[PDB]
């Protein structure tokens, strides 16, 4: 229920970016530069950290991203499964019973 936006995101078809890995990490990380320069803490939990799940290394050593590093924090467990897949959170949900 906390990540309720991304649950209904997985019912969508999405759009496939027509760019390389370097073209990918060029464009959202150019985006976050001036979204940071505009300021405000409202963007900070939305895109200022969620877009930082994009490393600029194809190689990843296996002692990180191991099948047992999904123990220290369960948030990226849900992010890598719920159609995030390594690559907007502003819709609230009324918390009534």
């Amino acid at each position: 229920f906390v990540h309720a936006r991304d649950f209904e995101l997985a019912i969508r078809h999405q759009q496939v970016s027509q760019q390389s890995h370097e073209g990918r990490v060029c464009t959202e990380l150019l985006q976050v530069v001036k979204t940071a320069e505009t300021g405000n803490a409202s963007h900070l939990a939305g895109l200022q950290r969620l877009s930082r799940g994009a490393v600029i290394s194809t190689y990843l050593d296996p002692l990180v991203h191991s099948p047992i590093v999904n123990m220290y924090a369960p948030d990226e467990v849900l992010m890598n499964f719920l159609l995030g897949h390594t690559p907007e959170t502003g819709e609230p949900s009324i918390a009534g019973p």
């Binding site: 976050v32 300021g39 803490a41 963007h43 900070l44 200022q48 930082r52």
Partner: peptide
Amino acid sequence: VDGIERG
């Protein structure tokens, strides 16, 4: 992103 966090 740290500067906004301590802004």
